[PDB]
Amino acid sequence: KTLRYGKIMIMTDQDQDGSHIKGLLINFIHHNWPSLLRHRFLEEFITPIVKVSKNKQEMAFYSLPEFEEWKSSTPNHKKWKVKYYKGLGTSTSKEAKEYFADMKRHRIQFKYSGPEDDAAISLAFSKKQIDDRKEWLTNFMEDRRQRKLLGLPEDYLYGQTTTYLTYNDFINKELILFSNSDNERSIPSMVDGLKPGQRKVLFTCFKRNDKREVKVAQLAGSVAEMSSYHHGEMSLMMTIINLAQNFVGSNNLNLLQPIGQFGTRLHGGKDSASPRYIFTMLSSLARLLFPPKDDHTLKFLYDDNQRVEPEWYIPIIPMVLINGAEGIGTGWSCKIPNFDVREIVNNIRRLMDGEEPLPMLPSYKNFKGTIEELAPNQYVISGEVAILNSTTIEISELPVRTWTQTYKEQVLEPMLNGTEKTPPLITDYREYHTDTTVKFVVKMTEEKLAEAERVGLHKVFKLQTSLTCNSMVLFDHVGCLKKYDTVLDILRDFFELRLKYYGLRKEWLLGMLGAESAKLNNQARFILEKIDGKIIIENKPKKELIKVLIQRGYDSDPVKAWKEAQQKVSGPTFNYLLDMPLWYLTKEKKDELCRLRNEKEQELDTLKRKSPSDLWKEDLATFIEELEAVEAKEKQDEQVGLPGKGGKAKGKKTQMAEVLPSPR
Amino acid sequence: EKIDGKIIIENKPKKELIKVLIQRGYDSDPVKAWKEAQQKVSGPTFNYLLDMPLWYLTKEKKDELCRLRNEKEQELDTLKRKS
Amino acid sequence: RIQFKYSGPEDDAAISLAFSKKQIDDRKEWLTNFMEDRRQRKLLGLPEDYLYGQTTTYLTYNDFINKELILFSNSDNERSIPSMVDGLKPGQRKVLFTCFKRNDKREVKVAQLAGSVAEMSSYHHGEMSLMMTIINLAQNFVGSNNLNLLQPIGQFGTRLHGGKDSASPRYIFTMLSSLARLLFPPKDDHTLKFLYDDNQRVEPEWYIPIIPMVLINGAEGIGTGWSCKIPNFDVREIVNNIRRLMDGEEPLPMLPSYKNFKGT
Amino acid sequence: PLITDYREYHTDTTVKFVVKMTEEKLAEAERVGLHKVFKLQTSLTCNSMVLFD
DNA sequence: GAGGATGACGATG
DNA sequence: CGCGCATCGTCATCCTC
DNA sequence: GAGGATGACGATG
């Protein structure tokens, strides 16, 4: 009674986001006041997610499995007018009046019995129960896989009216969906290495041509309109900005072109302007990375009866090894550094040959720093320093994760003045930083330089960086998570998954060329028959024309046949034989068609002659030519970024060999 | 004219075809003329006389065109008659 | 980096000219003189004068007031009050032209439409003003408008609290109305001459509606030198008045009317 | 205090006012004017008829 | 009973 | 992603010595 | 000299 309130009612949407807020609130309350979980202190308010209406008849549905059961149990499909309720802006005051007209349906309390539930309350909030959560997610994934294989429908809540709600089912049924969704959206798969947001953006970009430039804010709305994006607008724009970043230490191959200020390498890289201030344009590499002919390979999802993006893609190279996968999710995580793009082609060629591929080293574009690996899955990265004189010194190259403002505030300020425990190390410093390169006119006492050398230049200035790669967990082609050991095994798995598709593409291409080939052959035969002359065009009925076309061995539309054999794999159709203008009756058109019909025959004979092998190399040849062109453009940009200043002076430089602490 | 039959379609060069189209009183594209007389207000064009599919050679298409050509004449006469 | 120059107290009068509540007629004469000079220069084809042609060390206040701020005054006056021919402001004009560019059979988002309008109409006034203009075009409740060009989809603000309590432009949806097809027939596209900016076909300077919009939705414009405030009227009487005028008789006096309003 | 009670049963478009008042004060309100006391009158003038030709 | 003071306002910064 | 100060000018109230 | 405490982080609320 002393408290200002007696009951706490929280309300969220039917999405999984509210589950996290409810869990955090339960944690905040139970952490200090467990005894208040038995006096009707907490309750819940719920909202609808979808409503059907036909002939002034409405039905309420609060669960997606409930909607699936309603579809499986009712013979009316498309008969009911459906209306989705993703957010709060859709509902109106007239609906709120009906919502508050029935309290016993939405206002539901909770129930607590036995201390065992508290363990579950701690399960999602204990830093010492990581393996327990791992087993929990594994059990749920196995159960979902088994239920999907057996085709048995899963269980859901809010089927009928309820007065209370047990915590055990609350944790085991609702928050687990948020955990699964966060894990699915946080870490990309191993097949394409693209997150769902990047996937939606790239699919929307593929939908159009975009010959000219386009705004980011304008593109975000178009992406959200077709990709069914329901996560606000800021996250999508942030993902687009991350895709746009291509500076040193961020990415190695982007899908866009840098137009505007996308954040510099000086202050965090997050100092970019508004998405409407900046412009963007699609790159030329995406055309070769994802060939259009692969659209008939994967099966798209069916949401809102709309053709949407697929679940993954089939790139020519694993993107995780070129741009890095930094994902943080529940149960596991993923952090893979970058590598060299040139070595990937040589490794793939060696694997196609059948030889053991050479070990790779983490590389970065525009980075001259050497990396030595002493222990497996561990790397040491150091920069380069130049000693011009016994007093002056300059840092030539900085290691990865080195920002100008942070490095300055964390190194120069303690070294310049005398701190509480350390004397002033440096005497002077200058920052002549360019757009990409750095300059340090730093002076130091000659006597202190000997001590700095004895201790270590990389050690005193903190130029060494250690990283370990152990979380090699990625989504498999099936959907499972497996902790990997080496990169070469991932390359071999990708190679097998890619080899599986050469035959599929060959089967799709074979016969499809034959269809247009037979179509052109029939058209040429019709032209030759007209030159000879048997079909009278004197106002003859279409029925006699179709009868003659059937009696003279003319097939129907092959394109219609290939279209019919796509969803699951009157009478005849002859529109294509009558939709031809009179230009076909000219000598030049006939002469060019006589060889156009054989231009396809040449490729068809080549496909019948070629093997599934020797195609990957021919596909990579154009890609290597385009990559050399892109590198030439990058060198041209460097020439643009050339002010006219003198080259860096040659000077003594050394790399420290840290003792190996034998970690892990 | 095709029903009567004088223009041979046996791989004749386009030059002879254009010469025949000029000699038989066939004008150029009127849409091109109205487009030209819009900004400030090779030789002849006959693409529209050759971009027609074979469906025009059917009885039903000819019968419907015979009245479609007069559907516009009715509105043209009405415009010439109305104020 | 250019400094300024001050000579003589007379410039202070100009400094007060654009900032005196007792010199309204003086500003009116000033705008009138500028408009007459611009009309004469355009008719004679003589090029006007401009500043910053060569390097300058100082800048006199008299020319500063008479040459630079006057352009802002003219632009604000041109963009604030609509014309008498169509009664549409330049923002509404750009939005309606962009809407005419497409068909829009289904619904569309407001925030998504604003970018498409800004992309083709050469809009350079941020994004908030365009969305606010779209919201004002969307309002159709009692006491606001009598005939809109859109359809009410969502919460466009109620008649209880200011009418400005609407949600985010992305929260709400919109759809083109069916009356616009009859108000602006497509065949009128060959009548007006469009401007040529960026070598691109853009919206015209005005439109030719079947009825004066100022008498159906009101023109509330506040600009420099003058303003405009016209109340609403009845739509049924407009047709009778136009028929009587086509006949050649003296039209009857009208009375300000409002949709769903029984007040005399 | 002029009024004694009031209620606001407002719909989406229409309004409702269950308002009570002293019968004696109603006579004074009538003598003064219902539109005047409750401020229901609104005056507007249209003089700025300036438009772009 | 009249004049200075207070908001109504609609596109833009 | 909601939070908030103003401009140009015109006019309806409105209240006190 | 080792273990708890402090930030690095990337999509979303």
Swiss-Prot record, chain C:
It is found in: Cytoplasm; Nucleus, Nucleoplasm; Nucleus; Nucleus, Nucleolus. There is a cross-link at K5, K21, K28, K42 (Glycyl lysine isopeptide (Lys-Gly) (interchain with G-Cter in SUMO2)). The active site is at Y171. The record marks R170 as: Transition state stabilizer. The record marks R27, K28, K89, Y123, S129 as: Interaction with DNA. Expressed in the tonsil, spleen, lymph node, thymus, skin, pancreas, testis, colon, kidney, liver, brain and lung. Also found in high-grade lymphomas, squamous cell lung tumors and seminomas. The record marks I222 as: Important for DNA bending. Transmembrane segments: none annotated. Phosphorylation has no effect on catalytic activity. (Microbial infection) Deubiquitinated by Epstein-Barr virus BPLF1; leading to stabilized SUMOylated TOP2A trapped in cleavage complexes, which halts the DNA damage response to TOP2A-induced double-strand DNA breaks. Key decatenating enzyme that alters DNA topology by binding to two double-stranded DNA molecules, generating a double-stranded break in one of the strands, passing the intact strand through the broken strand, and religating the broken strand. May play a role in regulating the period length of BMAL1 transcriptional oscillation. Eukaryotic topoisomerase I and II can relax both negative and positive supercoils, whereas prokaryotic enzymes relax only negative supercoils. Homodimer. Interacts with COPS5. Interacts with RECQL5; this stimulates DNA decatenation. Interacts with SETMAR; stimulates the topoisomerase activity. Interacts with DHX9; this interaction occurs in a E2 enzyme UBE2I- and RNA-dependent manner, negatively regulates DHX9-mediated double-stranded DNA and RNA duplex helicase activity and stimulates TOP2A-mediated supercoiled DNA relaxation activity. Interacts with HNRNPU (via C-terminus); this interaction protects the topoisomerase TOP2A from degradation and positively regulates the relaxation of supercoiled DNA in a RNA-dependent manner. The N-terminus has several structural domains; the ATPase domain (about residues 1-265), the transducer domain (about 266-428) and the toprim domain (455-572). Comparing different structures shows ATP hydrolysis induces domain shifts in the N-terminus that are probably part of the mechanism of DNA cleavage and rejoining. Belongs to the type II topoisomerase family. This is DNA topoisomerase 2-alpha. The chain holds residues 635 to 898 of 1531 of the full protein.
